[PDB]
CSV table of C-alpha atoms and ligand atoms in Angstrom, one decimal:
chain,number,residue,atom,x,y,z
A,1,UNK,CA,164.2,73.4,-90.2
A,2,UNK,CA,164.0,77.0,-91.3
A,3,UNK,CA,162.4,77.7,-94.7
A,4,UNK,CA,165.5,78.8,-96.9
A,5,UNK,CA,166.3,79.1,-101.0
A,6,UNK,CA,169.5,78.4,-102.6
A,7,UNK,CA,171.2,79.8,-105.6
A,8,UNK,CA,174.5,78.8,-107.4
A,9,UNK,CA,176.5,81.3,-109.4
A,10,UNK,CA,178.8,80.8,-112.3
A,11,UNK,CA,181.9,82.6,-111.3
A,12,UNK,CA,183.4,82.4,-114.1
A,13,UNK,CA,181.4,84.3,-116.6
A,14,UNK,CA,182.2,87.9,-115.4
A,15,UNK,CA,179.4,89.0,-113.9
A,16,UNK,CA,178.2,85.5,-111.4
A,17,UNK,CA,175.1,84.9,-113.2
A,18,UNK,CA,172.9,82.2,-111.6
A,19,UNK,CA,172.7,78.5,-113.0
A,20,UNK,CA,170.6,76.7,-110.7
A,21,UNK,CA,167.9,77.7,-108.3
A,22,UNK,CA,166.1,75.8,-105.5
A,23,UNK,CA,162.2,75.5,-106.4
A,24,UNK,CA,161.4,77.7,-103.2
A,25,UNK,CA,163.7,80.8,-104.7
A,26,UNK,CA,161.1,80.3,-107.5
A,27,UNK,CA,158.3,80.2,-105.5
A,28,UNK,CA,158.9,83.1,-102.8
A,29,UNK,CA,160.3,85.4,-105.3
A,30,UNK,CA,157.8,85.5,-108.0
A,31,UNK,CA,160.2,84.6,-110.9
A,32,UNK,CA,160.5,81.8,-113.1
A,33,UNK,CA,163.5,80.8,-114.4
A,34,UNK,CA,163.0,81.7,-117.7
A,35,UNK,CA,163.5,85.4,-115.8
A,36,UNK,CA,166.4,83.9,-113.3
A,37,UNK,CA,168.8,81.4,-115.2
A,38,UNK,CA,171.8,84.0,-117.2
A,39,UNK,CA,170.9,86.6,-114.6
A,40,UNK,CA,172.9,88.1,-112.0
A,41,UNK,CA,170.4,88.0,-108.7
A,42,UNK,CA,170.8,91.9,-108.4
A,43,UNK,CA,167.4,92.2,-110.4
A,44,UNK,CA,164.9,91.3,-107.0
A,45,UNK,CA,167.0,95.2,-105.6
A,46,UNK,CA,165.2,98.1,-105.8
A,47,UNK,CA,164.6,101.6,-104.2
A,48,UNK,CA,164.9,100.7,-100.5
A,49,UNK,CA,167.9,98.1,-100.6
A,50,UNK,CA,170.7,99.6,-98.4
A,51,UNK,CA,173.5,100.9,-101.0
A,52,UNK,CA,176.5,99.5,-98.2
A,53,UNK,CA,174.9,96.6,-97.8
A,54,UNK,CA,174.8,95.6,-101.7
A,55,UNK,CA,178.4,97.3,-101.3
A,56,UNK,CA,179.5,94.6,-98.9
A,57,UNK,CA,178.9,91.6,-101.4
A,58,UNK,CA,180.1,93.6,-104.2
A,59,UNK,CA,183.7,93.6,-102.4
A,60,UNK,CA,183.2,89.9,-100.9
A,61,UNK,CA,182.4,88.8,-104.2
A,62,UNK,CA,185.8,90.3,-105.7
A,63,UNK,CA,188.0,89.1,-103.2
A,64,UNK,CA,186.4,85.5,-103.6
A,65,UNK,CA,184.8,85.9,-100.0
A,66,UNK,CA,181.8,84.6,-97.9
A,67,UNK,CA,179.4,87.4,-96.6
A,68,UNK,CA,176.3,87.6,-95.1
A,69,UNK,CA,174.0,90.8,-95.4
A,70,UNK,CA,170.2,91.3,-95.0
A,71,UNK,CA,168.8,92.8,-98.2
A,72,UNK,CA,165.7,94.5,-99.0
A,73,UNK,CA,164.4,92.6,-102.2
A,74,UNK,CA,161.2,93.1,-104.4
A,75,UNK,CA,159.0,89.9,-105.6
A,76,UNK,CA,158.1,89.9,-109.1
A,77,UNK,CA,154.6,91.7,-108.3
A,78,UNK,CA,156.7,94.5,-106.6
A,79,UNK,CA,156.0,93.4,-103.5
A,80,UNK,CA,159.2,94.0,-100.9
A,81,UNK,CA,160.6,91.5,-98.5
A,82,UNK,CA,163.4,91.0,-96.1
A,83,UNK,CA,166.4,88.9,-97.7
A,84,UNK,CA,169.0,87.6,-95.0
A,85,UNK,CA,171.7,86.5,-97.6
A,86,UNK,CA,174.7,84.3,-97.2
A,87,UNK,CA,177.6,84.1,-100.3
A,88,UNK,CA,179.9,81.3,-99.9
A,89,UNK,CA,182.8,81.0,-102.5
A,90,UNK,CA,183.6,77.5,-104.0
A,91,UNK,CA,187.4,77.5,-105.1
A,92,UNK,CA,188.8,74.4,-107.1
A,93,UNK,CA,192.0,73.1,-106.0
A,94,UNK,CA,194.1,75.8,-107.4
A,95,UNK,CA,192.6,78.6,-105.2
A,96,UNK,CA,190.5,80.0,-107.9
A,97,UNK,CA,186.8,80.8,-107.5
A,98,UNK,CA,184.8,78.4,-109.5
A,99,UNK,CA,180.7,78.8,-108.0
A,100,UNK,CA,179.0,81.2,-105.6
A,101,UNK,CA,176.3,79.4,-103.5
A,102,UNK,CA,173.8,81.4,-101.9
A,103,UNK,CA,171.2,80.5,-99.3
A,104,UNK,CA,168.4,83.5,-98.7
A,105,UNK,CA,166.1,83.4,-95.9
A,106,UNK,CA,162.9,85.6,-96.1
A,107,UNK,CA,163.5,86.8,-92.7
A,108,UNK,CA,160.2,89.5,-92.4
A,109,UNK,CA,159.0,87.3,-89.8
B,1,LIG,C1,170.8,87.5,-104.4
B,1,LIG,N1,171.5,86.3,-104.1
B,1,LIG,C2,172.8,86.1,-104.6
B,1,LIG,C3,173.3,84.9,-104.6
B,1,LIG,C4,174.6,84.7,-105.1
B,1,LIG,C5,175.2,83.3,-105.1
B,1,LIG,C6,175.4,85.8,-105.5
B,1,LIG,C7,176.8,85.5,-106.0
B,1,LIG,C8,174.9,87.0,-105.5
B,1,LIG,C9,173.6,87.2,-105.0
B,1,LIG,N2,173.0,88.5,-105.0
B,1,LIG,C10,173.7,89.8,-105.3
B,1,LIG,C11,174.0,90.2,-106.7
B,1,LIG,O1,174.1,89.0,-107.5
B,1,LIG,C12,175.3,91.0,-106.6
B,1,LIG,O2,176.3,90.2,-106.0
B,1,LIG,C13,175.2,92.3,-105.7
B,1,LIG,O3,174.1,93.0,-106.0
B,1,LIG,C14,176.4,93.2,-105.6
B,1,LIG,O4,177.0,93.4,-106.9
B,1,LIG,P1,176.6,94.7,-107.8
B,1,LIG,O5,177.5,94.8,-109.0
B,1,LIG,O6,175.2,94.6,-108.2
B,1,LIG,O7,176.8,96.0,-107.0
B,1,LIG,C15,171.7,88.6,-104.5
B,1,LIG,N3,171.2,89.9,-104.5
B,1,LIG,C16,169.9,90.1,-104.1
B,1,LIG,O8,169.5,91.3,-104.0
B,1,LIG,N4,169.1,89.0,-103.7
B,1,LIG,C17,169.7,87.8,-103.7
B,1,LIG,O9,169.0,86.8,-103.3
């Protein structure tokens, strides 16, 4: 298929810091996961991403949402690339948010 990474998220520590990481999110962003595991994925932002954009999965992420958004992101050697993002939620049985799961496609083409 398409080359693609996947993330998971804890929901529930406070802030969705990431657990597990595909070896390709490794390997196209730069970062090992020394730098990725107890983080939330906001650290590949910087000065270009979109402020809405980033405000989009802010608000999906609170109301326990999916979402999709393209992202401007930054590899580890500051390099920028285009992140076409999708958030899926992952509820246990009683409705609450357990996991986010991610799946980012480097979509500069
Ligand atoms: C990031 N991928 C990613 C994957 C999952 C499963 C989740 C839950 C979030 C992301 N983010 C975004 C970041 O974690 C955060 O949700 C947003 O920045 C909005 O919240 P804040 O408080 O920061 O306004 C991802 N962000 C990226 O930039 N790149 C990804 O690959």
């Amino acid at each position: 298929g398409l080359r693609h990474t996947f993330v998971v998220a804890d929901a529930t520590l406070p802030d969705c810091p990431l657990v597990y990481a595909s070896e390709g999110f490794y390997a196209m962003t730069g970062y090992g996961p020394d730098e990725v595991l107890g983080h939330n994925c906001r650290f590949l932002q910087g000065e270009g991403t979109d402020p809405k954009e980033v405000q989009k999965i802010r608000d999906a992420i609170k109301k326990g949402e999916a979402c999709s958004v393209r992202l401007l992101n930054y590899r580890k050697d500051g390099t920028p690339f285009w992140n076409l993002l999708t958030v899926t939620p992952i509820k246990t049985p009683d409705g609450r948010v357990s996991k986010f799961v991610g799946v980012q496609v480097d979509v500069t083409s």
